[PDB]
DNA sequence: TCAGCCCATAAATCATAGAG
DNA sequence: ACTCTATGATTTATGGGCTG
């Protein structure tokens, strides 16, 4: 099951993944349906309300749009 | 949700291993692979994503 | 300017189609 | 007949290029 590449290429080098709770996810999903975009303020109040950071909320929304972009809906 | 056909995997694996030094097909290349395999470019992307990672993982 | 967006990708993890 | 592994998709998270 082990791979033996004839040579080790750059892309081959490196570069636990916390899961969100039903509540966090449900709420985020809930917020996103109110407005696919967030204001610096709303971003902060939601981050505190869900024990998540600002970054994590920003990123969660970024990813959420990519998914919204995809699935054309 | 079934798996890709036998021919589609051979095609993707062939492209993949033929480009081991840089397994990052362009948008056009992804579209041509998708056409021949009969899937979406998105499925091609997932396919390369999983392949790239699962491969370096077993080195 | 520059915080925030898009896009492509990483890496771990979910779900289950089938090869053993 | 039945068990796990490999496989396709989805979920967190990084970074770069670009524009309001």
Q: What is the CATH number of the domain that holds B10?
A: 1.10.10.60
- Between CA A14 and CA A18, with CA A17 as vertex, the angle to 5 degrees is 155
* Strand D neighbours among B 4-33, CB < 7 A: 4, 9
Q: How far A69 CA lies from chain B's nearest CA (Å)? A: 12
| The domain defined by A1-73 carries CATH number 3.40.50.150 | no
Structural domain count of chain B: 1
Lookup: tokens for B41: 């470019």
Query: Which of B59, B56, B4, B57 minimizes the C-alpha distance to B33?
Result: B4
Distance CA A38, CA A60 (A): 11
Phi, psi (rounded to 5 degrees) for B23: -70, 45
Expressed in percent and rounded to 5, the helix, strand and coil fractions of chain A are 55, 0, 45
State the sign of the Cα–Cα–Cα–Cα dihedral A26, A31, A33, A34.
Answer: positive
- Full domain range(s) for residue B46: 1-59
- Between CA A21 and CA A20, with CA A35 as vertex, the angle to 5 degrees is 10
Phi, psi (rounded to 5 degrees) for B20: -50, -30
Distances (CA, A) of B46 to A37, A63, B10, B24: 26, 15, 16, 12
Terminal CA-to-CA distance of chain A, rounded, Å?
40
């Amino acid at each position: 099951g082990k791979k033996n590449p004839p040579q080790i290429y750059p892309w081959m080098k490196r570069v636990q993944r916390t899961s969100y709770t039903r509540y966090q996810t449900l709420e985020l999903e809930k917020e996103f349906h109110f407005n696919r975009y967030l204001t610096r303020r709303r971003r902060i109040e939601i981050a505190h309300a869900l024990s998540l950071t600002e970054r994590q909320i920003k990123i969660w929304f970024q990813n959420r749009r990519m998914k919204w972009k995809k699935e054309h809906k | 949700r079934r798996n890709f056909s036998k021919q589609a995997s051979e095609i993707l694996n062939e492209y993949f291993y033929s480009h081991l030094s840089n397994p990052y097909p362009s948008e056009e290349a992804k579209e041509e692979l998708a056409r021949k395999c009969g899937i979406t470019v998105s499925q091609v992307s997932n396919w390369f994503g999983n392949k790239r990672i699962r491969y370096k993982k077993n080195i």
